[PDB]
Design a protein around this ligand. Sequence first.
Ligand SMILES: *[C@@H](C)[C@H]1/C(=C/c2[nH]c(/C=C3N=C(/C=C4\NC(=O)C(CC)=C4C)C(C)=C\3CCC(=O)O)c(CCC(=O)O)c2C)NC(=O)[C@@H]1C
Ligand SMILES: *[C@@H](C)[C@H]1/C(=C/c2[nH]c(/C=C3N=C(/C=C4\NC(=O)C(CC)=C4C)C(C)=C\3CCC(=O)O)c(CCC(=O)O)c2C)NC(=O)[C@@H]1C
Ligand SMILES: *[C@H](C)[C@H]1/C(=C/c2[nH]c(/C=C3N=C(/C=C4\NC(=O)C(CC)=C4C)C(C)=C\3CCC(=O)O)c(CCC(=O)O)c2C)NC(=O)[C@@H]1C
Ligand SMILES: *[C@H](C)[C@H]1/C(=C/c2[nH]c(/C=C3N=C(/C=C4\NC(=O)C(CC)=C4C)C(C)=C\3CCC(=O)O)c(CCC(=O)O)c2C)NC(=O)[C@@H]1C
Ligand SMILES: *[C@H](C)[C@H]1/C(=C/c2[nH]c(/C=C3N=C(/C=C4\NC(=O)C(CC)=C4C)C(C)=C\3CCC(=O)O)c(CCC(=O)O)c2C)NC(=O)[C@@H]1C
Ligand SMILES: *[C@H](C)[C@H]1/C(=C/c2[nH]c(/C=C3N=C(/C=C4\NC(=O)C(CC)=C4C)C(C)=C\3CCC(=O)O)c(CCC(=O)O)c2C)NC(=O)[C@@H]1C
Ligand SMILES: *[C@H](C)[C@H]1/C(=C/c2[nH]c(/C=C3N=C(/C=C4\NC(=O)C(CC)=C4C)C(C)=C\3CCC(=O)O)c(CCC(=O)O)c2C)NC(=O)[C@@H]1C
Ligand SMILES: *[C@H](C)[C@H]1/C(=C/c2[nH]c(/C=C3N=C(/C=C4\NC(=O)C(CC)=C4C)C(C)=C\3CCC(=O)O)c(CCC(=O)O)c2C)NC(=O)[C@@H]1C
Ligand SMILES: *[C@H](C)[C@H]1/C(=C/c2[nH]c(/C=C3N=C(/C=C4\NC(=O)C(CC)=C4C)C(C)=C\3CCC(=O)O)c(CCC(=O)O)c2C)NC(=O)[C@@H]1C
Ligand SMILES: *[C@H](C)[C@H]1/C(=C/c2[nH]c(/C=C3N=C(/C=C4\NC(=O)C(CC)=C4C)C(C)=C\3CCC(=O)O)c(CCC(=O)O)c2C)NC(=O)[C@@H]1C
Ligand SMILES: *[C@H](C)[C@H]1/C(=C/c2[nH]c(/C=C3N=C(/C=C4\NC(=O)C(CC)=C4C)C(C)=C\3CCC(=O)O)c(CCC(=O)O)c2C)NC(=O)[C@@H]1C
Ligand SMILES: *[C@H](C)[C@H]1/C(=C/c2[nH]c(/C=C3N=C(/C=C4\NC(=O)C(CC)=C4C)C(C)=C\3CCC(=O)O)c(CCC(=O)O)c2C)NC(=O)[C@@H]1C
Ligand SMILES: *[C@H](C)[C@H]1/C(=C/c2[nH]c(/C=C3N=C(/C=C4\NC(=O)C(CC)=C4C)C(C)=C\3CCC(=O)O)c(CCC(=O)O)c2C)NC(=O)[C@@H]1C
Ligand SMILES: *[C@H](C)[C@H]1/C(=C/c2[nH]c(/C=C3N=C(/C=C4\NC(=O)C(CC)=C4C)C(C)=C\3CCC(=O)O)c(CCC(=O)O)c2C)NC(=O)[C@@H]1C
Lengths: 162, 162, 172, 172, 172, 266, 289
Amino acid sequence: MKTPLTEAVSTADSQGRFLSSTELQIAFGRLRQANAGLQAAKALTDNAQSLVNGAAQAVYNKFPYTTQTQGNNFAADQRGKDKCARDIGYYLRIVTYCLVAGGTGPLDEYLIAGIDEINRTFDLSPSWYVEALKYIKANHGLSGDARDEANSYLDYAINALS
Amino acid sequence: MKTPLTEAVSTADSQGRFLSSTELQIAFGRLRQANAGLQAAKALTDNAQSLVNGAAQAVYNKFPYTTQTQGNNFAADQRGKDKCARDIGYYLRIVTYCLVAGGTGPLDEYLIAGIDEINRTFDLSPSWYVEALKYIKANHGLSGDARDEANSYLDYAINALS
Amino acid sequence: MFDVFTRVVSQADARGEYLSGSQLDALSATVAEGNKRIDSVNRITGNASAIVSNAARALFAEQPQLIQPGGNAYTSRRMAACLRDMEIILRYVTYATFTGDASVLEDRCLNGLRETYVALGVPGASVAAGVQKMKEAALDIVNDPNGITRGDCSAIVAEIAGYFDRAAAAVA
Amino acid sequence: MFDVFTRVVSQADARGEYLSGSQLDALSATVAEGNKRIDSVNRITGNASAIVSNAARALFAEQPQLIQPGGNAYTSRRMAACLRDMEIILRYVTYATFTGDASVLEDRCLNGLRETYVALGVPGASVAAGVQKMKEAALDIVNDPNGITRGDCSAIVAEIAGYFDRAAAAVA
Amino acid sequence: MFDVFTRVVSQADARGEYLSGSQLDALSATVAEGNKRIDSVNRITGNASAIVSNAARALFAEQPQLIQPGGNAYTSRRMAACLRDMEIILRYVTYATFTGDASVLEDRCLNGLRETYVALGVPGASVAAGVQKMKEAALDIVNDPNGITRGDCSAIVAEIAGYFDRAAAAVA
Amino acid sequence: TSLVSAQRLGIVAVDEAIPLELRSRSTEEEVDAVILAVYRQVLGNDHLMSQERLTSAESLLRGREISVRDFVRAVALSEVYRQKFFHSNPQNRFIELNYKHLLGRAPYDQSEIAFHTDLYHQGGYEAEINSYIDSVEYTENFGDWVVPYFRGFATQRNQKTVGFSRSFQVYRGYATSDRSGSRSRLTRELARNTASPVYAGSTAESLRGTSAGSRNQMYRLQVIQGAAGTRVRRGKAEYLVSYDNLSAKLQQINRQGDTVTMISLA
Amino acid sequence: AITTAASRLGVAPYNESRPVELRPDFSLDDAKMVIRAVYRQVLGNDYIMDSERLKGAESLLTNGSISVREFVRTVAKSELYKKKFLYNNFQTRVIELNYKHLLGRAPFSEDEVIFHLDLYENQGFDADIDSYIDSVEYQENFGENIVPYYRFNNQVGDRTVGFTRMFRLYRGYANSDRSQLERSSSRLATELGQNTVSAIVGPSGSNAGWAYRPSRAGNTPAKALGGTVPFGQASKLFRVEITAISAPGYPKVRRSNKAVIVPFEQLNQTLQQINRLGGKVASITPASL
Ligand SMILES: *[C@@H](C)[C@H]1/C(=C/c2[nH]c(/C=C3N=C(/C=C4\NC(=O)C(CC)=C4C)C(C)=C\3CCC(=O)O)c(CCC(=O)O)c2C)NC(=O)[C@@H]1C
Ligand SMILES: *[C@@H](C)[C@H]1/C(=C/c2[nH]c(/C=C3N=C(/C=C4\NC(=O)C(CC)=C4C)C(C)=C\3CCC(=O)O)c(CCC(=O)O)c2C)NC(=O)[C@@H]1C
Ligand SMILES: *[C@H](C)[C@H]1/C(=C/c2[nH]c(/C=C3N=C(/C=C4\NC(=O)C(CC)=C4C)C(C)=C\3CCC(=O)O)c(CCC(=O)O)c2C)NC(=O)[C@@H]1C
Ligand SMILES: *[C@H](C)[C@H]1/C(=C/c2[nH]c(/C=C3N=C(/C=C4\NC(=O)C(CC)=C4C)C(C)=C\3CCC(=O)O)c(CCC(=O)O)c2C)NC(=O)[C@@H]1C
Ligand SMILES: *[C@H](C)[C@H]1/C(=C/c2[nH]c(/C=C3N=C(/C=C4\NC(=O)C(CC)=C4C)C(C)=C\3CCC(=O)O)c(CCC(=O)O)c2C)NC(=O)[C@@H]1C
Ligand SMILES: *[C@H](C)[C@H]1/C(=C/c2[nH]c(/C=C3N=C(/C=C4\NC(=O)C(CC)=C4C)C(C)=C\3CCC(=O)O)c(CCC(=O)O)c2C)NC(=O)[C@@H]1C
Ligand SMILES: *[C@H](C)[C@H]1/C(=C/c2[nH]c(/C=C3N=C(/C=C4\NC(=O)C(CC)=C4C)C(C)=C\3CCC(=O)O)c(CCC(=O)O)c2C)NC(=O)[C@@H]1C
Ligand SMILES: *[C@H](C)[C@H]1/C(=C/c2[nH]c(/C=C3N=C(/C=C4\NC(=O)C(CC)=C4C)C(C)=C\3CCC(=O)O)c(CCC(=O)O)c2C)NC(=O)[C@@H]1C
Ligand SMILES: *[C@H](C)[C@H]1/C(=C/c2[nH]c(/C=C3N=C(/C=C4\NC(=O)C(CC)=C4C)C(C)=C\3CCC(=O)O)c(CCC(=O)O)c2C)NC(=O)[C@@H]1C
Ligand SMILES: *[C@H](C)[C@H]1/C(=C/c2[nH]c(/C=C3N=C(/C=C4\NC(=O)C(CC)=C4C)C(C)=C\3CCC(=O)O)c(CCC(=O)O)c2C)NC(=O)[C@@H]1C
Ligand SMILES: *[C@H](C)[C@H]1/C(=C/c2[nH]c(/C=C3N=C(/C=C4\NC(=O)C(CC)=C4C)C(C)=C\3CCC(=O)O)c(CCC(=O)O)c2C)NC(=O)[C@@H]1C
Ligand SMILES: *[C@H](C)[C@H]1/C(=C/c2[nH]c(/C=C3N=C(/C=C4\NC(=O)C(CC)=C4C)C(C)=C\3CCC(=O)O)c(CCC(=O)O)c2C)NC(=O)[C@@H]1C
Ligand SMILES: *[C@H](C)[C@H]1/C(=C/c2[nH]c(/C=C3N=C(/C=C4\NC(=O)C(CC)=C4C)C(C)=C\3CCC(=O)O)c(CCC(=O)O)c2C)NC(=O)[C@@H]1C
Ligand SMILES: *[C@H](C)[C@H]1/C(=C/c2[nH]c(/C=C3N=C(/C=C4\NC(=O)C(CC)=C4C)C(C)=C\3CCC(=O)O)c(CCC(=O)O)c2C)NC(=O)[C@@H]1C
């Protein structure tokens, strides 16, 4: 799982090496970041319901056909809106994992890998989730390093989807 | 290992029961004993070389043919004397384990189970080790509960050998 | 299975050495904690039914999908089995607390439990959540300062937490 | 492979839950100790050759059966392999210390190691004795007060000891 | 299990064939050797305890790690199990000598024995060395010219050596 | 595979492995890393003595005179590889070692064994080794510049499902090696075109409770049985018995004439 | 087999039952049937309270973590089995019970008592239990997957004395090993030591003389040594076992149980006299040739 600490070790291990100053500097970089990530994770968690709901409606506003067309892949009925808010919650929850982990590991392992197969298979538009992610970027209220690290993971998801 | 604590749990588990006052009282019994057992173990350990060498010499005195007769099972050469001292040390060290564990569990597991087959296979006389064990009983200088518990384990081995 | 004492003995025997004065003193300090350990086992055991039921209630409230029709704890037999497992795990945790060593819990309860659950379809993460709920209740009961001689139980409480965590990880 | 952070994450995802405020504070307290952890890795690494060689010499002095002709560490190839294993285990102990989680030991160093030793006839109890000796030498190195900002490293030393114990138990 | 006669029968039945004149003649030669075979079985049996104990002593003399503390043959129960195993193998080797066919040894002794030792952590290469020591003692006993009608037992000795070799190969 | 399964099966490190490719204008460190990875893979993770290293082949690779695939082949044809895996092994064990080392998988069917036994009988050792490295499977997975890596734990195009189960017979864990010859664990299941249960990582474990005797250990005996007593319901059976009853169980199986295929701790 | 006398001997219900087998891929109802059968067989048809159930062993059986035989083994080694059958019994009684529960038959010979008494004394109860379950006899009859059951019918390897002794240990269907007239006493200590047998007395309800039991001393021997000479002119002798004698009362009646050897020519008088004593005929057996 992509994270500074686990990547320092797996790289050293692949080279048969003890950890050296380089991996120690990696750890210092992790320590410099971690509190902001944990602060960012807390802030996103506390507003999870608001962000998820606002993101869901932002998508509904931008793609009104989703709340009006009948179909398993759309949110016209109640199940679809539940599926949709669930999916957006997945994105937001896993992003906080990335802030906690200090890397894209959680996004790669839990969401990104295979998402293209899923969206094709169930006829789910990547654009819907991009709009949801864009909303969370604009509304999470973070600042400083917490904002920077958080937007990197949101953008990483956006780039993966587009 | 037969120790008070493991036996209590094993009997409770056989009945699918949580521990009750009976087992708590087993624990108090162990606690009442344990400090004395540990003090005995330290005293035997500190005097181990004296006790082991003395015990070996006591066997050689009572059974002089063991140091005079040629044969793999006897101690007429340095090879045999070393085996013998090693064996007596085994008895002493494991007895200290019994004092630490609070039961014959270590003697049962490490030494007593199968001793008959060994003594028969390699033509060792159990009377030799009885004599060594009597020497140790009579020279450990323990008093009180430490003496009582140490001698119960020394007698347990003697009884097993006879 | 080992207790705190025989754990050290077995390590010493494999090296063919007497216990050091440092090891013996460590055991002496354990003996000095014995009353606290006995109280902790007594307190958990005295409250076992409550610990299990309250944890199970809380668990299903957070995970209603377990008890909806078709859920893994749906139907009396499966609910009954689930409640039974929660008590088994608690019971073995108290065994480990009593002995002062995790071997009873690991050897008899946890070894092979994950595989049983995976084969059955029992959701390990939900079992682990249940175990965590039981852990919190158990630790509060142990730490309750009323009706007991006052003193510091942080060491024993930490040991008990470790045993609960072992159980949670073994199935999680 | 997990580190101290992703271990928590993996459990939380299995429940579909955000990290709790307590888990975040817990991870924050981990960050607070980060410098101590980095120093401990740095110190063991700086003395790795001496730790390994001193432990090896001590092991063969306690267990001279290993190096006499016919012994499992007799012949240069076998001695060389034995020394490599000691170094390998120590290296992976530093990895676990670095990451703050045991998974790297369980995934890589210890994964099948007992099977390997049984197949080869390597005396696993003896390997455990050698690991214990590196452990004692490593913790003294970590606890050395000289030339370092003084502070209390007891938590990390206890964690490191756990990693050494895990290695020893895996082959014992 | 098969003996020397039924081994041939089984092969013939699978072909739907009467034994040929050559096959019958070979069994007649086997019959003519029967007294030597009985004598070999009687000699090995009559020295079984000495064969086993002498072999065990020699093994532990050459491989002292087996009996050092923490060694697989250390402690009375393990030592007794080891001596038991040696005697078992010797017993089934005598059975194979008696019947003139390895099947009893293969089916009833060596069946799964390598896997059993691997699972138990018993050093199979050391069992093999033990079996070789018993082999060498047994063959000298069988070949002893004193107190027996003189004759050539080379063929039976080779057959017995073959059975010992199977056992040593199988356990390793 | 994903964490939930890889953790139980002891293959997390395999899953997170990244193919190593030798790029244009590589550094000395990158060549060194590649040489190390080749030795680990092709020699099945043996401890490699400095006296055993291919000095010349290493030089040529470092000089970009030969490709990574050429260097893999140099190591596979070396006397080190032969001594480790060929001279003391039966042929079928040798062949599955070649599949593990060179293609990173387990053999799929008996005909693969037959093909390679024929090739060895026809063109000898070099022709046998070259068949793996020159194969379409080698070229399309690793080409000329990527070090081979174990593939058997991932769904491959044109594999057989049983390749996944069999992988656990030839890959025994991260801290293992193909050093002791020995026999193939795959012989029977290849010959009869069947599969065997996967007991790896922690999947061998079974519950003890109060039924596992004095040592709290269960042993899993896998047997092939027939009706030569009570009725036999399956030709393949497993028994879980405690240490104390293990001798009695072996003797029971032995007396019935049934074959023990595997025993392990549970 | 046993057909005509099956009902009066209490065998008919077992004639009507099949062995309880746990098939591979068994269903939960299969597991429940095994558990019920094992509790009834191995615990001698004692009522089992919910607090006494071996819930963990039952779980492991249901899960396939232990086979039927290993579940039997666990029940036999449990504190529940030992409380019922070990702690309060003479070891010869324990051996009788083990044979009935785990092998479904009665001991054949004194050699079996020697073996199991020494095994218990040298290695403990658990070791002794294993000897029954790991025995060749257990393997041949029940194997890994069948609950032990009473082996009333003649099999290869049997001895006749086994058949008569089963009705010293089995006292009917609505009965348990702990609810029999002889209570804790060994049923077979004397039979085994002397290698003798006793006339079969079937269960209550279907046999009026079901309570007949001989005393410690002063019993009538089985066979009429001396023939008809003491009786004068008599064609043949029979040994009649009589129980529940009360009518004359003490001291005219001392023991309510009595066995007499009487000639054919007095059987009419004997039955008449027995009836007037209030007694019930337990068994009649030819005593001369
Ligand atoms: C227990 C392990 C011992 C111990 C450790 C300890 N270290 C610090 C503080 C620091 N250690 C470092 C480490 C490095 N700086 C570098 O540039 C590199 C080389 C690449 C390393 C390894 C740093 C950066 C700090 C912080 C600044 C400082 O120099 O103090 C502490 C102080 C507390 C803290 O958390 O920082 C402690 C306790 N101290 C002992 O007494 C043990 C023997
Ligand atoms: C190699 C094994 C050695 C050897 C054997 C040998 N023995 C005989 C002949 C006989 N041996 C026996 C054996 C027994 N008679 C008994 O009553 C018993 C006890 C139950 C035994 C074991 C017998 C009956 C004979 C035949 C009579 C005789 O004494 O000759 C021979 C002779 C060849 C033959 O087949 O008869 C031989 C060669 N002789 C050696 O020199 C080897 C060291
Ligand atoms: C000393 C009292 C007398 C004596 C001793 C002697 N012993 C042996 C050989 C063995 N002793 C043991 C005993 C143990 N092994 C264990 O693991 C333990 C339990 C932890 C015990 C008690 C064993 C097993 C052996 C045989 C194997 C071995 O050598 O280790 C000998 C040599 C016997 C031989 O034939 O080589 C001797 C000389 N002999 C005397 O005359 C003393 C009076
Ligand atoms: C109604 C007559 C009274 C009542 C009901 C009540 N029940 C519960 C909780 C549970 N009920 C069940 C029952 C079943 N679960 C099943 O799967 C099936 C078989 C198909 C049955 C019959 C169970 C298992 C529970 C506990 C778990 C759960 O919450 O689902 C409650 C709540 C109890 C609690 O502590 O939460 C209540 C209130 N209560 C009354 O007062 C009514 C008169
Ligand atoms: C409750 C929090 C969760 C849950 C549990 C659940 N478990 C089972 C089934 C079994 N549980 C065990 C475990 C044990 N048996 C033992 O003897 C011991 C001690 C060694 C343990 C730990 C076993 C063996 C089984 C299988 C056999 C049995 O039924 O007892 C079930 C039933 C599964 C089924 O489909 O039958 C359930 C429901 N399920 C949840 O959803 C909760 C998260
Ligand atoms: C720890 C979580 C809490 C705590 C425990 C504690 N207990 C004691 C002392 C004793 N407790 C007992 C217990 C029992 N006595 C009995 O008869 C039984 C029933 C079978 C039990 C369970 C005993 C005997 C003692 C010693 C005598 C006394 O009167 O105290 C202490 C004091 C220190 C000591 O170990 O002796 C402590 C600290 N105390 C807390 O404050 C925690 C909430
Ligand atoms: C003698 C020329 C000089 C010398 C020797 C010396 N050697 C050691 C230690 C070891 N020597 C070896 C060598 C071998 N072991 C083998 O198995 C083989 C192949 C058959 C060889 C050649 C080894 C492996 C060791 C280390 C482990 C052991 O002690 O067995 C020492 C002691 C070193 C230490 O630190 O303990 C010494 C003194 N030293 C001199 O000064 C001489 C000029
Ligand atoms: C002696 C030369 C070596 C040695 C032996 C050793 N074996 C065991 C344990 C077992 N050995 C067997 C083997 C058999 N049991 C049988 O019934 C048969 C015939 C069918 C055989 C071949 C078994 C089954 C066991 C385990 C069960 C049991 O003991 O009954 C041990 C003890 C293992 C342990 O205590 O964990 C030992 C020591 N060990 C050495 O070091 C010698 C090289
Ligand atoms: C979907 C209905 C269910 C499900 C599926 C699932 N499968 C896997 C993993 C594998 N599936 C296969 C199967 C094949 N591979 C092949 O090449 C062939 C054709 C020749 C088959 C049939 C294999 C080999 C694997 C393992 C290797 C790999 O994953 O690539 C998973 C992943 C498990 C994990 O932890 O990664 C899943 C999820 N899962 C469900 O819940 C459904 C019931
Ligand atoms: C030294 C304290 C003891 C000892 C060691 C010894 N080990 C081997 C052989 C191997 N050791 C390993 C272990 C690892 N390889 C890895 O890659 C990892 C990390 C993931 C580990 C832990 C392996 C795989 C082998 C086999 C491969 C190889 O030997 O090259 C030997 C050599 C045995 C032999 O030559 O046959 C030795 C000697 N031996 C002792 O006596 C010490 C107690
Ligand atoms: C045939 C000439 C007469 C006859 C025979 C008859 N016998 C039975 C039933 C049984 N016979 C035995 C006898 C033995 N069991 C033993 O173990 C031994 C020695 C090993 C003997 C001799 C037994 C025990 C039974 C009952 C149990 C069983 O049969 O399995 C019957 C059937 C009784 C019934 O059906 O109720 C019969 C018919 N009957 C005649 O009329 C012939 C004169
Ligand atoms: C209740 C009205 C009266 C009463 C009853 C009582 N009975 C027992 C014990 C047993 N009852 C039976 C009966 C059966 N078991 C069966 O399997 C069958 C059907 C085929 C029947 C009819 C048995 C065998 C027993 C003994 C087994 C056991 O576990 O007890 C008791 C228990 C006596 C005691 O525990 O000491 C009692 C109390 N008692 C009264 O006072 C009521 C008049
Ligand atoms: C020794 C002082 C006298 C003596 C004893 C003797 N006893 C037997 C045989 C048996 N002894 C028992 C005893 C017990 N069974 C139990 O369950 C218990 C309580 C737990 C006891 C004490 C039994 C049942 C037997 C029969 C089985 C057996 O033979 O072991 C014998 C043998 C008699 C025979 O004919 O074989 C002897 C010799 N004999 C004397 O002369 C001494 C006065
Ligand atoms: C009174 C405490 C209990 C009790 C007694 C009771 N007894 C009988 C009947 C008989 N009692 C005997 C006793 C003996 N015969 C002897 O030879 C001796 C030793 C020398 C004794 C003690 C006998 C033979 C009988 C039957 C003949 C007779 O009735 O006189 C009864 C009457 C039985 C009946 O069914 O009528 C009773 C009531 N009953 C209880 O409930 C008390 C516990």
